[PDB]
RNA sequence: CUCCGAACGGUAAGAGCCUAGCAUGUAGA
């Protein structure tokens, strides 16, 4: 099934190899779980503003 | 609060109990989730007067909001009292609430048959809040002590 | 399981305020160290100290010669460390205790940056002083047995690292003192001089003598007094 | 006296959030006092009155609240409260055709505590009970069969207050 | 707000109307606040506050300016504008400037006395910025 | 009976001060005879 | 060495906070 | 993880924050592929680009309940609780409408009874129609006029619990 | 003619791998 070359091991499902690539020692290398929020306005501007951008 | 702290802190993440006072599992998983799920006569006993309390406290909630009027808190009373027996906390706790929803019932069969001798007496209608407060308050109360102690032994554990 | 009456308690952990308020709780809190219902009981040392408790129970403290929430000790003052592996204690050991253990500990929204709290803080305003030496890392059990202590070694070696003698008085005499300074070795030229109360001795090549100065580093206790002891010429000035 | 309206405003726990070291006194003492529940339900407001009020005692871990004021009418007051809800309620039925009744459900069953149009309230649909004492008979107590707490509250002509 | 009396104030309520929907926006403004800040308890010190605010401010016009009637003052204590215990414990002679209710009761406190709410400060230390934990300040 | 009144509350239950520091105290916080 | 006592409540609390 | 997007940011109306909808509706919408895949990151530029790139409205669909890619996206805003003047923000972009919509249920779920209805009056001008999905799963024609006219309702949507303060009139009673 | 029942006695037995909702609030320098 699926495969984790950072841990070498095989994961029988889907959950448990997206589980093994974060939320582990792996993570840990990675930074572990912390992830913030990015601002408020200049995100949401950027973004609507790329997502315009690209759609039209 | 107090019963859903019961519940998470049996490190049982299966079963997530209904604010209107139900219970009921939520992966379709038991057999050895069930195996340490099934038990405790006092807590399925204490939910079950709960729910009979939280289902006249908020019988009056809706009352004094939007539906009040004479209709509702006398017929839901008077069916709170019927539903003692068919809806809500059934036999399957203790022996003789059977005996007591049995008086309920001939009770209520006493109230509507006299009440209803006129042209009022058909269909659904008041049925005065008189033996529902009574009767149900005297079982409660007999109810008091037992339940206080099979409670705290059951806290206890 | 373990009631008492009143805690074995410090001369420092009380506080230092002749009139203190305790507050007895029957059966709380669970020793720290043994797991065991005991009494606990909490007062104020003083003003602005930190309201300090009682860790660790009658029988856990009693046993092992300890005060009940410092874990030092109810005779010296020392360690349970220092007092098992090493006498060298009485010159160790401190009077007139420090109340620098009964003070707030950091607050932690000042080490952050947002103490709310503003001047009103019950905790105390200084820095954290810094992890890296192992006087931040003790803990309660294995400072409470003898085997791993921060502490313990860290003044152990305070223990080996480190003539004008005075405060004669009426106590000592010249007999007294050439028959204690006998013991150590023989005499070349020795006198006393009663104008500043004060002895000169000397030793053939020193060494016995040094360990004398081991001895009288405001530590040879003879006839009841704290002797003074500076250091002598050695240079014909 | 809103204390217990903003102590109680912690249904949940940030696990410090009125969460720290409280959690443990809140799953206890629940079981000491279903009790709690069998004054609960005994001095809920009758028919003859609107809303009233009560006792309460609360405990500053807030986990419970028994209802302390043991419910205590008049005999011909109550006898004559209930029985004019008796009266109106048969000629109620005597008069409209109202097809209607409650829900099964008084509320549904995934909701809140629905702690808000009720913790300001403001709102009484007060038209409860009472028939309309006629004022050429019923003189002597006109001021009397309309009060639910306060009939035996009178404080006059001899009610012992 | 509901008044749940039906009695339509003797005297008219108009005089302090406009003091007591301000008082009551501030209180239900003070209890719509969130748990925000505050560590165990420092947020409900606000509500009592307020509450001892509004008590001061019926006091104030009831018995000292002298303004009002008896019957408008019983009409407010019965509604809930003003306290009962709080207006007998502010008419004593020792005190008339209290805290709160909380720390005039002697069970209150774990070692059996008064908080330090109600102490003198000419009598107290003269480096002290504690405030009163049940009440809000001193 | 005042024995046995006490014993069978615990059972039921269950089923200042003046103190001289005459052990170190000497220079220590100097005062403390009573405590 | 600990033993009992009978001590005025009022000048305990007045010397305390003197 | 799946437990706590913000370690101390805020709290909700009377819950969990990361409980707002339903345990078995929570515990269901655990285990998808769109969800483990916003689960492995999710920013608000994400969040955005999630709500363009899926238009659909609807919750679980058929006996094996899976949620929705909205659901889903609403449950990982409930859970990272994003600011309000993103969320304002969202309600007043009109171009994207799909996105537009989750910040009209983000502002319904989470905001105020006041602030839903300064949100809401400019929603019911909205005639552009959108895409639904049936309990089914079969695909169903809106417009999002009457989903937001649905959501300033009652509660009778799946997978939402959201109660009102008072009526229109008591409310303009109360306030503006 | 209108007296309505609940649970236990019941789902196996384990092998290697994978992921989670919680809980204490300390004396020390
Ligand atoms: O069908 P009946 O034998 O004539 O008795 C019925 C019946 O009571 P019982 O079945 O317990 O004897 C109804 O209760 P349900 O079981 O049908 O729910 C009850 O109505 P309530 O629930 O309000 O008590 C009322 O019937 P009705 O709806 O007309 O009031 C009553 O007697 P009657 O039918 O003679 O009135």
């Known amino acids: 099934g699926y495969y984790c070359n950072v841990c070498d091991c095989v994961v029988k499902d889907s959950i448990n190899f997206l589980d093994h690539i974060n939320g582990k020692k792996h993570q840990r290398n990675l930074g572990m779980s912390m992830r913030v929020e990015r601002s408020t306005l200049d995100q949401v501007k950027k973004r609507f503003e790329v997502n315009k951008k690209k759609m039209e | 609060n107090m019963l859903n702290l019961l519940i998470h802190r049996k490190n049982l993440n299966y079963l997530h109990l209904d604010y209107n006072f139900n219970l009921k599992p939520v992966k379709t998983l038991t057999t050895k989730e069930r195996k340490k799920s099934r038990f405790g006569n006092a807590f399925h006993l204490c939910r079950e007067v709960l729910r009979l309390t939280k289902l006249v406290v908020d019988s009056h909630v809706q009352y004094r909001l939007g539906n009040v009027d004479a209709f509702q808190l006398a017929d839901g009373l008077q069916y709170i009292f019927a539903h003692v027996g068919q809806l809500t906390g059934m036999y399957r706790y203790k022996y003789k609430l059977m005996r007591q929803i049995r008086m309920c019932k001939d009770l209520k069969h006493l109230i509507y048959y006299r009440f209803n001798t006129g042209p009022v007496g058909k269909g659904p209608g008041c049925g005065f809040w008189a033996a529902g407060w009574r009767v149900w308050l005297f079982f409660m109360r007999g109810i008091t002590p037992l339940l206080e102690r099979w409670l705290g032994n059951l806290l206890a554990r | 399981w373990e009631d008492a009456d009143f805690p074995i308690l410090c001369q420092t952990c009380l506080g230092e305020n002749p009139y203190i308020r305790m507050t007895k709780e029957k059966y709380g809190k669970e020793c720290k160290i043994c797991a065991r219902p005991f009494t606990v009981f909490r007062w104020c040392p003083g003003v602005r100290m930190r309201f300090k408790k009682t860790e660790v129970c009658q029988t856990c403290s009693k046993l092992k010669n300890v005060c009940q929430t410092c874990l030092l000790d109810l005779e010296y003052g020392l360690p349970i460390q220092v007092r098992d592996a090493g006498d060298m204690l009485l010159k160790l050991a401190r009077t007139t205790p420090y109340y620098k253990r009964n003070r707030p500990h950091i607050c932690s929204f000042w080490v952050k940056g947002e103490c709310k709290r503003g001047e009103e803080c019950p905790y105390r305003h200084e820095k954290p002083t810094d992890p890296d030496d192992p006087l931040a890392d003790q803990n309660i059990k294995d400072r409470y047995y003898g085997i791993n202590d921060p502490v313990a070694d860290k003044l152990l070696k305070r223990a080996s690292t480190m003539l004008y003698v005075g405060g004669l008085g009426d106590t000592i005499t010249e007999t007294d003192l050439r028959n204690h300074f006998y013991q150590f070795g023989e005499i070349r030229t020795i006198t006393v001089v009663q104008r500043q109360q004060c002895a000169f001795i000397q030793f053939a090549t020193r060494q016995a003598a040094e360990v004398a100065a081991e001895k009288s580093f405001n530590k040879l206790i003879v006839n009841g007094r704290r002797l003074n002891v500076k250091w002598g010429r050695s240079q014909a000035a | 006296p809103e204390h217990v309206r903003k102590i109680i405003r912690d249904h949940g726990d940030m696990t410090n959030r009125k969460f720290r070291h409280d959690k443990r006194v809140y799953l206890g003492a629940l079981k000491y006092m279903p009790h709690a529940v069998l004054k609960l339900l005994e001095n809920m407001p009758m028919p003859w009155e609107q809303i009233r009020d009560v006792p309460v005692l609360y405990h500053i871990t807030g986990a419970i609240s028994f209802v302390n004021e043991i419910p205590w009418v008049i005999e011909p007051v109550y006898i004559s409260q209930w029985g004019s809800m008796w009266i109106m309620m048969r000629r109620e039925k005597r008069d409209r055709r109202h097809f209607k009744r409650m829900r099964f459900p008084p509320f549904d069953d995934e909701e809140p505590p629905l702690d808000y149009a009720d913790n300001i309230l403001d709102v009484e649909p007060l038209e409860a009970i009472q028939l309309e004492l006629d004022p050429e008979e019923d003189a002597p107590v006109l001021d009397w069969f309309y009060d639910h707490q306060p009939l035996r509250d009178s404080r006059k002509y001899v009610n012992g207050s | 707000k509901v008044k749940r009396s039906r009695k339509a104030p003797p005297d008219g309520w108009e005089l302090i109307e406009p003091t007591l929907d301000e008082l009551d926006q501030k209180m239900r403004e003070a209890e719509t606040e969130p748990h925000e800040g505050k560590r165990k308890v420092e947020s409900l010190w606000p509500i009592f506050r307020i509450h001892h605010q509004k008590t001061r401010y019926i006091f104030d016009l009831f018995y000292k300016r002298k303004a009002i009637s008896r019957e408008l003052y019983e009409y407010c204590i019965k509604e809930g504008y003003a306290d009962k215990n709080l207006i007998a414990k502010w008419k004593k002679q020792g005190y008339e400037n209290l805290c709160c209710l909380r720390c005039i009761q002697t069970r209150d406190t774990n070692f059996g006395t008064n908080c330090i709410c109600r102490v003198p400060k000419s009598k107290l230390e003269v480096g002290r910025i504690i405030e009163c934990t049940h009440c809000g300040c001193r | 009976r005042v024995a046995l009144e006490k014993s069978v509350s615990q059972k039921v239950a269950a089923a200042y001060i003046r103190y001289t520091p005459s052990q170190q105290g000497v220079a220590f916080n100097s005062g403390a005879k009573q405590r | 060495y600990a033993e009992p006592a009978h001590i005025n409540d009022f000048m305990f609390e007045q010397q305390r906070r003197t | ?176």
């Not at chain 8, 319904?108 to 049936?134: F, H, M, V, W």
């Open chain 8, 1 to 176: 993880m799946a437990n706590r997007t913000v370690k101390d940011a805020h709290s909700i109306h009377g819950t969990n924050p990361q409980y707002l909808v339903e345990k078995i509706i929570r515990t269901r919408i655990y285990e998808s592929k769109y969800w483990k895949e916003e689960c492995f990151g999710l920013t608000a530029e994400l969040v955005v680009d999630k709500a363009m790139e899926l238009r659909f409205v609807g919750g679980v669909y058929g006996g094996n309940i899976k949620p929705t890619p909205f659901l889903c996206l609403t449950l990982k805003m409930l859970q990272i609780q994003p600011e309000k003047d993103i969320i304002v923000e969202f309600i007043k972009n009109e171009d994207f409408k799909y996105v537009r919509m989750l910040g009209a249920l983000y502002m319904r779920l989470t905001g105020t009874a006041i602030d839903c209805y300064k949100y809401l009056e400019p929603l019911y001008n909205d005639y552009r129609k959108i895409k639904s999905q049936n309990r089914n799963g079969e695909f169903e024609l809106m417009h999002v006029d009457e989903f937001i006219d649905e959501l300033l309702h009652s509660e009778r949507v799946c997978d939402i619990i959201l109660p009102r303060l008072q009526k229109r009139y008591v409310l303009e009673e109360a306030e503006q």
